């Protein structure tokens with residue numbers, strides 16, 4: 001009877017694996033687990049940064065939201081793969097992606113983090129956490145709360161099959177402000193929540209109550225997304241430039 | 253293994269009954285029509301403040317009352333915590349930061365029971381203050397209760413009764429994702445069990461309400477934001493008015 005739950009599960013797993021080049025399996029088999037393919041370049045301080053492409057803190061935060069925008073296209077193509085999603089009202093598809101993209105970015109940035117730093121480029125760099133903390137004062141405490149979140153989150157040791165379904169759950173919320181038709185949204189989340197329970201039950205047979213521990217991390221995602229959006233304040237009081245980046249501004 | 257948690261469910265229900273004099277069941281019989289003796293005196297403007305204070309600045313005297321209700325609630329929350337199995341076997345310092353900010357995440361869960369879309373029970377349930385008398389208040393004060401209402405009406409949609417809430421209240425306390433917690437893991441093995449109790453209890457009490465377990469856990473997000481806002485505006489009310497005094501218990505919970 002619960003066959004579609006196992007089915008939807010690898011439906012989502014397959015889209016996940018198409019939509020996202022760097023899988024968690026791949027990322028962690030490069031970070032901690034001695035990969036071998038070709039150790040990524042490491043950035044530990046101010047001069048290893050200089051000549052990695054081979055001011056500092058501004059262009060590093062910029063670079064981050066450059067990639068955040070690539071990500072959104074990856075996530076948007078995923079959402080559209082979730083059964084029921086495109087059949088929603090089209091405004092609602094947009095409200096769901098608008099309000100849920102940050103949460104998914106920070107869930108998946110966990111996959112590329114360990115306690116000592118984060119994979120850069122796509123697994124071809126690694127920027128140490130200790131270097132990031134030694135950035136200027138607007139930027140020295142931005143990436144820190146995400147590491148703090150990641151180590152907790154990875155302790156759950158989910159893989160990509162788990163994350164595939166979890167990501168779909170975040171999108172199909174039902175409490176985003178400005179939704180015109182919540183029921184098809186909440187009825188889909190229901191089927192997703194149920195496939196995720198199953199998946200966690202059989203892929204993590206003796207990690208009891210992982211479902212519950214995972215749902216309550218959605219609490220800490222939103223605190224993170226909140227404090228992140230609030231940090232975007234510096235933008236107003238920064239070394240705001242002159243005309244050299246117009247188009248780019250509204251690109252972001 | 254099943255009646256494990258139903259004996260745990262039972263246990264907590266009892267303490268809850270013993271610890272909190274105004275349950276949801278009682279409050280829901282007052283806010284409706286189950287009354288000839290239980291009907292509240294309704295306050296909605298300021299000469300309902302008036303004669304209202306026979307049947308035992310205004311915006312201030314109300315706020316303090318609300319802040320004093322919270323003290324009572326801290327006291328009863330603490331008594332209920334001690335009954336949660338294993339809770340009292342934890343590091344003295346840990347217990348204190350388990351019942352720190354969690355005291356408010358719970359207060360607003362139980363405030364929801366005294367609320368409908370149009371107001372909140374007051375004084376023993378004797379009273380009932382409307383949402384709009386509150387919103388229509390002064391300086392920052394007219395801001396305070398409104399988001400509790402927003403949460404209260406969407407929370408109350410879940411249709412939880414006391415037996416459900418008892419366990420969920422427990423799960424809130426025994427979290428273990430709180431600043432200062434020396435020895436975490438014993439906390440989240442306790443909580444691990446509560447969630448088992450909650451899971452079984454919800455499926456059994458609300459068999460038709462699928463994924464209520466999931467919907468309910470999610471609401472903890474809304475709770476933290478509610479405390480955030482409350483704490484937040486509870487800094488302004490300290491510059492605008494340096495005359496109001498804050499209760500000793502509320503005093504050091506607030507950091």
Ligand SMILES: O=C(O)[C@@H](Oc1cccc(C(F)(F)F)c1)c1ccc(Cl)cc1
Pocket residue numbers: 314316317318319320321322372373374375376379381
């Ligand atoms: O009537 C009450 O129970 C309290 O006054 C209140 C007045 C308005 C709102 C509230 C609250 F329940 F929303 F917090 C309490 C109250 C409690 C104790 C003393 Cl001493 C004074 C006022």
